[PDB]
Amino acid sequence: SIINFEKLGCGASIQKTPQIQVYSRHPPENGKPNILNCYVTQFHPPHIEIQMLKNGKKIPKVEMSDMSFSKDWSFYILAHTEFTPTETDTYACRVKHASMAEPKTVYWDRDMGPHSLRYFVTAVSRPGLGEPRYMEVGYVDDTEFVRFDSDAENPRYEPRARWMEQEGPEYWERETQKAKGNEQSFRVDLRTLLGCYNQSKGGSHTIQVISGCEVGSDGRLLRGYQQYAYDGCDYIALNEDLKTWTAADMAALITKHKWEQAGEAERLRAYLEGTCVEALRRYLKNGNATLLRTDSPKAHVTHHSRPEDKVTLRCWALGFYPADITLTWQLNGEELIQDMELVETRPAGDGTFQKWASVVVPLGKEQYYTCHVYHQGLPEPLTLRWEP
Numbered sequence: 001s002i003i004n005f006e007k008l009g010c011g012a013s014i015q016k017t018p019q020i021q022v023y024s025r026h027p028p029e030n031g032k033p034n035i036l037n038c039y040v041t042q043f044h045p046p047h048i049e050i051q052m053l054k055n056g057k058k059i060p061k062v063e064m065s066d067m068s069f070s071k072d073w074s075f076y077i078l079a080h081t082e083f084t085p086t087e088t089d090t091y092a093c094r095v096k097h098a099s100m101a102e103p104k105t106v107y108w109d110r111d112m113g114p115h116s117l118r119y120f121v122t123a124v125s126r127p128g129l130g131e132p133r134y135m136e137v138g139y140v141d142d143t144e145f146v147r148f149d150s151d152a153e154n155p156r157y158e159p160r161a162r163w164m165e166q167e168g169p170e171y172w173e174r175e176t177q178k179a180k181g182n183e184q185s186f187r188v189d190l191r192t193l194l195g196c197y198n199q200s201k202g203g204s205h206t207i208q209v210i211s212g213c214e215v216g217s218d219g220r221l222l223r224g225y226q227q228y229a230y231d232g233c234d235y236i237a238l239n240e241d242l243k244t245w246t247a248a249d250m251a252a253l254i255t256k257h258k259w260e261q262a263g264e265a266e267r268l269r270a271y272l273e274g275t276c277v278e279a280l281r282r283y284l285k286n287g288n289a290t291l292l293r294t295d296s297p298k299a300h301v302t303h304h305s306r307p308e309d310k311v312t313l314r315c316w317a318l319g320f321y322p323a324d325i326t327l328t329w330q331l332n333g334e335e336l337i338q339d340m341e342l343v344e345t346r347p348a349g350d351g352t353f354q355k356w357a358s359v360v361v362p363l364g365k366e367q368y369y370t371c372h373v374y375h376q377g378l379p380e381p382l383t384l385r386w387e388p
Contacts, residue, residue, distance in 0.1 A: 001175065001279045002119040002136055003211055003226075003271045005182050006264055008189045010196035011254045014231045015099040016074055018043035022093045023112040025348050028085040036083045036108065038093035039346045041076040044232035045204060046124055049096035050079045053105070055089060066147070068137065069120060073208055073229045080349050111304055111314065112343070112356065114222055115141055117280035118212030123186035127202050132190055134183040139212075140283045140291055142322055148179040155180070163287040193230055196251040205231055213276035224272035228252075242269040294377035295321040295352055301371055301386045306360060313386050314358040315371030319348070326374040327357035 019042045025035035038052055046067060052059040065078040083091065091108040120137045134150035136157075145161040156176040159165050186207050194201060207230055214223040226238035234248035236255050243265050247256040259265065284291060297317035304312040315327055323345050329336045336359055345355045361369055366386045373382035 005185050007185045008255045010251050016044040017099040020106045022106050022108045038079040042074045046075045051094045053092045073232045114216045116214040121209035123207040125190045136179050166286050213272045296377035297375050299373045299382050309363040310360050312358050316356045319352045321352050323353040328372045329359040330370045
């Protein structure tokens, strides 16, 4: 259960460039259906235009995941489309974003315990296009389990996990009405932050919040979060003592003063130690059948013939959950950490993740190199080599 926010009340009177990966869900085999993914990350502002292209032409039915953001405030989103790869068809992803002067086109290259309850809140103004878009997204660990999205005629909280369907109507009604009240606070804060930052009246701006708690197996609060950002930059945050505020900016000092006088840190500490812990306990219980499950990576090495007497070995980890993983290459028992190439871990689109790490090695020396895969789901680390 998310907190009821208090207005920031800053008083009366920033671009990040997207990173893009294009890759298939399953290893491509010509003639057999697959999914092509376009994973776009690390961008701010959240407005973005993603097209997928086949032989230079816009692909019609392209699915878009809901947009999320990470702890560094940057947004991410997965686009995908059904496709059957052929030997000669070219695919690409084209991304248009205010950080870039021209659209970016990225071509598909066949060589491709404690628990936490956190709410990720986004409010984005859209002047001349409608009311601000407001979203509340709840996660137990990294599992999204509830979502409120204002961009609907009769918006309301919806379960994003089957185990939340147990909750009765009184729960959904309470959460929905609280979200609609929260939406109003952020609408007002968006208006007043314009003046506090001496900004023009016609641009889109964003408020982001991370709010929640991390709780140990003994049921004691390990960490509480109440962090705000404006236009992708830190604004104010509750300190680990749950008593004082860090204001990252001159504008936020006005909020800090008001919240001190109003005792907002004590209201937060009570929510965190009370409602937040109790809700997490409740959600962990109903989600017990699925929330603790892990999927171990399946790994294999591919071989790619490079210029002259060098080859690339690529160590793949597929189908794993959660996303945290480590891949290393070894020669003679030493880790080649500085000569590897890696990709950022990326969703397959079915709930599991992919990653690979490659090293360039002398032709004929491939058997001297070992890839190592470290994941919490494995009994012990995987060790593998290239096999013709």
